[PDB]
């Protein structure tokens, strides 16, 4: 499986999830099962935690190719979480069994997608650039913010989500958007 | 886990490789190793039935204080395909130059 788009809407009111199953000839039997949303408070290593933020079952929406593609637009204010200072973790699962000719490693039933609001980072960069316009000196806080973002990106890409949570809570938690 | 085993084995092999090359390693790091494999045997034994998910969160977040603390212990790598900003591969396909009462339309 894979994500088509996974972002918070530009108006900071919806959390957009658009999932699809991969198009190979050996995934015809594989469908989509459920979508589970977790935050930086409830996240756990081994799969979605108990008491998640938002559980979604795909059978309910549809009445077979329809179940291979799913799109959602979750009003974040209905989830009772802050769109500015929240790190959503989106798990997806597959109610299927791939063929026997599946190459080794491609039969991964679960995926994960981390979401943050990019608006506060954009505004912070604009503030730092405005400060740079005065006397053409780069603030050290600006380089710090850039490198801390790169650290969180590396933590996400290597799968080390808890240390990414520590960095996010410690460095980027207070955000205005 | 199957991974705390790997981390502990790698950590102690690095420990004894260091004790082979040099004749010394900081005991402040031997302490980290002791904590690490004590946790590994704690979680892979008869005492893993006392662990809630809150306890799991706390144990993991306490273990990642040991991650880059020394050269024996490294940051584990898991099989991940995510990132903070994702790519949008959706395609635009309008219908015969049509629009709804307020906005555009596609297939």
């Amino acid at each position: 499986m894979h994500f088509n788009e996974l972002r918070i809407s530009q108006d900071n009111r919806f959390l957009i999830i658009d999932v699809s199953v991969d198009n190979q000839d050996y995934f015809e039997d594989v469908l989509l099962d459920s979508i589970v949303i977790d935050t930086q408070d409830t996240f756990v290593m081994n799969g979605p935690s108990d008491n998640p933020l938002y559980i979604y079952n795909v059978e309910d929406a549809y009445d077979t190719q329809q179940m291979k593609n799913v799109r959602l637009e979750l009003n974040i204010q209905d989830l009772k979480v802050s769109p500015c200072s929240t790190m959503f973790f989106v798990y997806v699962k597959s109610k299927g069994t791939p063929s026997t000719d599946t190459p080794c490693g491609f039969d991964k039933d679960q995926i994960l997608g981390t979401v943050i609001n990019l608006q506060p980072i954009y505004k912070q960069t604009l503030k730092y650039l405005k400060e740079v316009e005065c006397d053409c000196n780069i603030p050290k806080g600006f380089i710090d913010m850039i490198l801390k973002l790169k650290a969180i990106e590396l933590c996400v890409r290597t799968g080390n989500y808890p240390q990414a949570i520590k960095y996010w809570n410690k460095f980027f938690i207070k955000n205005n958007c | 886990m199957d991974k705390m085993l790997e981390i502990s084995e790698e950590a102690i092999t690095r420990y004894f490789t260091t004790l082979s090359q040099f004749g010394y390693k900081k005991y402040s790091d031997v302490d980290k190793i002791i904590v690490l494999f004590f946790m590994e045997e704690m979680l892979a034994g008869e005492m893993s039935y006392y662990v809630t998910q809150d306890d799991y969160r706390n144990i993991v977040n306490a273990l990642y204080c040991l991650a880059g603390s020394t050269c024996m212990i490294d940051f584990p790598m898991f099989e991940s395909y995510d990132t903070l900003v994702h790519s949008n591969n959706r395609t635009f396909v309008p219908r015969i130059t049509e629009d709804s009462i307020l906005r555009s339309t596609e297939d």
């Binding site: 081994n46 108990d50 | 886990m1 979680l43 893993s48 662990v51």
Partner: peptide, 19 residues
């Protein structure tokens, strides 16, 4: 793989639900 208490509770409850 690692199980917590809650995982065992779910498994046993679901076993008993269907027996």
């Amino acid at each position: 793989m690692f199980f917590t208490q809650e995982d065992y509770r779910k498994i046993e409850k679901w076993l008993l639900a269907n027996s």
